[PDB]
UniProtKB/TrEMBL annotation, chain A:
HAMAP family, per database record: GyrB
CDD domains assigned to the protein according to its UniProt record, in alphabetical order: HATPase_GyrB-like (cd16928), TopoII_Trans_DNA_gyrase (cd00822), TOPRIM_TopoIIA_GyrB (cd03366)
Protein name in the entry: DNA gyrase subunit B
Organism: Mycobacterium tuberculosis
Localization in the cell: Cytoplasm
Lineage: Bacteria, Bacillati, Actinomycetota, Actinomycetes, Mycobacteriales
A GO biological process held by the record: DNA topological change
Automatic annotation (TrEMBL), chain E:
Family the entry assigns: Belongs to the type II topoisomerase GyrB family.
Binding-site list for Mg(2+) 1: 17
Highest taxon in the source lineage: Bacteria
Compartments in which it is found: Cytoplasm
Gene: gyrB
Function as written in the Swiss-Prot or TrEMBL entry: A type II topoisomerase that negatively supercoils closed circular double-stranded (ds) DNA in an ATP-dependent manner to modulate DNA topology and maintain chromosomes in an underwound state. Negative supercoiling favors strand separation, and DNA replication, transcription, recombination and repair, all of which involve strand separation. Also able to catalyze the interconversion of other topological isomers of dsDNA rings, including catenanes and knotted rings. Type II topoisomerases break and join 2 DNA strands simultaneously in an ATP-dependent manner.
Organism the protein comes from: Mycobacterium tuberculosis
Site (Interaction with DNA): 42, 45
Note from the entry: Few gyrases are as efficient as E.coli at forming negative supercoils. Not all organisms have 2 type II topoisomerases; in organisms with a single type II topoisomerase this enzyme also has to decatenate newly replicated chromosomes.
Subunit structure: Heterotetramer, composed of two GyrA and two GyrB chains. In the heterotetramer, GyrA contains the active site tyrosine that forms a transient covalent intermediate with DNA, while GyrB binds cofactors and catalyzes ATP hydrolysis.
Protein's recorded name: DNA gyrase subunit B
Amino acid sequence: AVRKRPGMYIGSTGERGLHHLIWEVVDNAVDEAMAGYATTVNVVLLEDGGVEVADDGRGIPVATHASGIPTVDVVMTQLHGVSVVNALSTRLEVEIKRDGYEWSQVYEKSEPLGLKQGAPTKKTGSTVRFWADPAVFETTEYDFETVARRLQEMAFLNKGLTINLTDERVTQDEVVDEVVSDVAEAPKSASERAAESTKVKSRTFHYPGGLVDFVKHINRTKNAIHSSIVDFSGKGTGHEVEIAMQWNAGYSESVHTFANTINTHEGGTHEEGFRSALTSVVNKYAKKDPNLTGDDIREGLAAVISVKVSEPQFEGQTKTKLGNTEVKSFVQKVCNEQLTHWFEANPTDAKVVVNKAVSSAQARIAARKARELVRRKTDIGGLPGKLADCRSTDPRKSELYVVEGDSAGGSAKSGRDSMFQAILPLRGKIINVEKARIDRVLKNTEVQAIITALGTGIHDEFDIGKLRYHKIVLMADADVDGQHISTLLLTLLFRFMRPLIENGHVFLAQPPLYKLKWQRSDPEFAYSDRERDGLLEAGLKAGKKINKEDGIQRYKGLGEMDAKELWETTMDPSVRVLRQVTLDDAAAADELFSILMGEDVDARRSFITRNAKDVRFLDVGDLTDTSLDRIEPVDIEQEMQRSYIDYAMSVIVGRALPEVRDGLKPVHRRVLYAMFDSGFRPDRSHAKSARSVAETMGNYHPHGDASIYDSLVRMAQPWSLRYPLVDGQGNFGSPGNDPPAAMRYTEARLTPLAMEMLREIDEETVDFIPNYDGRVQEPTVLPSRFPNLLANGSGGIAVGMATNIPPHNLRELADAVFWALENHDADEEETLAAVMGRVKGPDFPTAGLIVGSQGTADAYKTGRGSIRMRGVVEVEEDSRGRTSLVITELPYQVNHDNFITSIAEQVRDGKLAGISNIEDQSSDRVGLRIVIEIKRDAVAKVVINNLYKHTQLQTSFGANMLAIVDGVPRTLRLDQLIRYYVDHQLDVIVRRTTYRLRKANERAHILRGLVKALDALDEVIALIRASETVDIARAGLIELLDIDEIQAQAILDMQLRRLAALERQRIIDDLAKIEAEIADLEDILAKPERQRGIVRDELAEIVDRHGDDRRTRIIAA
Amino acid sequence: FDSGFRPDRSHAKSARSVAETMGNYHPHGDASIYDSLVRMAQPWSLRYPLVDGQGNFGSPGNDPPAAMRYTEARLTPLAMEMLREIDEETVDFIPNYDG
Amino acid sequence: VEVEEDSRGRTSLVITELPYQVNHDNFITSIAEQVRDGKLAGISNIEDQ
Amino acid sequence: TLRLDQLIRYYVDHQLDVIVRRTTYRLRKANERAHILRGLVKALDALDEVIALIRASETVDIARAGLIELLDIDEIQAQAILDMQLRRLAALERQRII
Amino acid sequence: ADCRSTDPRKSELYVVEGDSAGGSAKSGRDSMFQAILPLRGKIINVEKA
């Protein structure tokens, strides 16, 4: 019945509808706590796509209904709802505890099977278990963050209710904690690690304070002015109200209204009753200027209004607008009487909230006055030269495409149907309006262009009736920049143009995700993996042909498509499918937007870590699936979440955190792989840097030369890397402010150690993935035959994640690895204690000293520590007898020229005394030589100590041992860094041996075919000659000699020079040697002991040849 | 031409043509190179376009072309007449920037 | 330049071709600015269709 | 600063230069190909003895010197016979050379 | 980058473009009598200035 169109009931056949299944089951379960019969509601998310909703209420009526069948079946099968949940589910189970018994009922494809009576028990409640229909829904994977956000909210509205959420679709290594630690996990003993295998993400929400705890939660990130939250209630005839409010230092209205726990985002009678009463009370307290508007008072205010109406009447585009005219009168009476009570009882707090409204009133007055001066100064108006208008003058028919200028500005203006489609190319950067005030928001030229295009105005002067386009389409890229822009456009709309979302005017473009490039047939377009797979299958079964590498194009940017393509696939109303932005919960969305776009770096860093990797689940809804202007509704909560996680992970992986296995970021790895593939080896003459920059650019990293050349130069500088990976020729700059020379002048090649990063990469030792254009392959990780991440270190900061791994001594690290190889079975504590003691501490390329061992110890056992670095000072006396301090060494990454400047700036300002001059006498022959002449009056020791105190001559290294582990950002202990590295090394060796064996058997097969031909050479040559075409010579060879097609091709492609006596023997000799190589290769695969020895012997060989003396001296105190 | 980005073959990402130019002939920023490519592709710039482009190459107004990694480019048949038999020693060649 | 009369009967000029190398966006802005400054008269609006 | 006739003539002068250089190159590479083909033809006519010479020979360097004396050929012509694959000894491939 | 020598007769100043040989001149030099002035900006045409 309902199955025919999900829509008119559940909303959409996607995420919105999938989450709407949980909402209905949770709503009637929460209805018990509102009635005062339930205290605990427990929600469980199952691995099989099921949801368990348990309560301790009264239980679903089991008694025989007036029709004939029991009431439990009537509510579940017949409409008037939870009956829709059963209608769009494959299986529904109900465990009811009512009338002092344990009832049990199972619904197979909505149809009931029978109500079974079980064990008698005095306790009451009900438990609902449902498995979503995979044939109906596009996805069956529930979002944990969305469910938790609504439950936390539901617990705020019900004082006596406790909500316990559990998520089973969690791996035993997945980040599950809401508050993610900035330190590593304690080392587990073999016992407690094994006992666990013989995990579930869980959250608890209980707020006794009710709406006071809600206001405290809203004003946690915001700075509350008054330390006293307003709390009052009112009881009516068929209604009840509860209001809590507190002002903050911010410049945004955070007022959330609810009716019978349901979020009334469209507002209504109850919100209007509060609003009118708030402006009445506030303005009356003033005791002569113009009256304060509601906007002025509500600006920087956090409030929650929760009404409980017996018979609720609804209005608006969504069922979230309370129209009960008796509630306006009721809320206004309760507000006017209780708001005056607070303003009189707390006058100290009242004076600041009125003054905050006064500041806000003068802010809009000054803005209107400044607006009026420019407003009347014969201007055409609109955005001339920016906006490309449509011919139509009717908003109903008019569509606006908001697109990034650099992405699809020109193509959208060309592809479009200029009769009803207008284009707004954003030719700048959209500011993050989350905590910004309307003045700063209106100062942004892109934000102002959007406001001018729409014609509505903003917050105070907003008018939905003046809207120029009834369709606002956001056309962003499916790349890091595109996803970032989406988050920024969604924040602008939610916070400043929310009614546009609610009235269904905000849309997101759905461009193709793939282009299937058939050899003969016309290119096809896929908007999902299931569509791509389906189109790929269907056309292979229609005999079409496609290249296995560069045959299916994956779109990242709209700028890849021609105007025609862009129109036909995403702009044409006859074939496009627009994604309508919906706002189902304004309170929940406010929490999500505040976390992601706010200023709480911790809650942000925590959100990204627990959502980093995609949810481990079997999405059966994406495996099976059963009009002109097509519209698909997507929720802002889900869409914003997707967008921010995608943006955050792209900058985290891309330029912030290195992969633990090789210690590299994509850029460095891509430069190194490009140089390697070009044959820029240490045994060959240097190649110009431009050559290496271009190879990286055109094949792996298609961005500006500067970023690529930056990676090359940093890997070449002997002061940047403890073990440089690029052998540079020419000017690569200085540890000061001297930059490298142009890439066309400097020369680069790989160092012998860089060759150890790339060692046997061609021997299928690492996973390769297709590159940016899918034409060729690039490695995911380099073999890294030496522990590079620890040896060379790594920096980088992106979206709340920062890394600082210091460089180390290769010889010392090798010992830690050698111990880890030999003692492969040792537990976490035994490894940690062994690695520490073998690796003394950080070893910087810029030598210097470390003062103390506490920070070094902290960084190894916890992944976080403060390592104090100190440079080396020498004392000199000239001819006359004048003393000067000579800086011979400095701490790591301290810029020489900036250090000299800081001292000079401190001396002239009198902050540093005893210094008479500073000079840079440094050269290759004299080493570092910063000469600081000291006044005859001054004591050398007293000047040196002041240089430690006030300059970078003594600075701290804030170690944060954070790296990418199996795609996830993780803070690690030293043992974890060594072990993860060793695991990669053993993987490289097994993958190496496997390849070598396959290619040895392939060579042997060929050589056996040539040997057969050499044994009967006379008749082989006679067969080729006698035969007319190459094919009969080929077929004749397969018959004459018991061989295959591959062997025949080896005999035919055989050169006449190979028939010589020393050349015939070369084949015979080579074939016999292969069987000994095969036995040894097969022996390595069968022996993990041999593989461990291969890692040991090859590392020792690298350490004996490239290992060096410690540079940084470790001193105490 | 040397890369084989000819009309008979599929468009290659503009970054490929920029990198090939940069590394072997014009070792300067990508911007100056991508500017040449774009202007030789734009039908409002050239009376006889020498580059055949795929994607957003901008507009005769202030709309810039998309990033070189997104746009695709190959020679037009007219550009093939420019390079026609250049491998047949028809023109004087000189050593490139690194000889 | 082409001439058009709409539903209302309002007259508007339509630029269908421009000289070589003249930037369309800069052309619209110069008209807009010259109208704003009072240098150009008889124009009520400019649109890129 | 040029006149239309100067712009037209300098262009026409470049086109004539391109054709003379194209004809020169094409003639040189035609003679180069033919010299190699004449060697292959010599080897095809005396195939039994050419194959027998290489097979009896110890090294490839003692094989080349014998091939230069067997057929009336030079170093460049002899190398092309050594680099000639077994698949080229097919009747239509032998005729293709001719 | 200063030289140790205070004698103008013995002292030498190498005026170089920072982007060209700022680093290499400062490293290669004999810092006893050779000083380096890397030009980190643009020299203006002073002819009619």
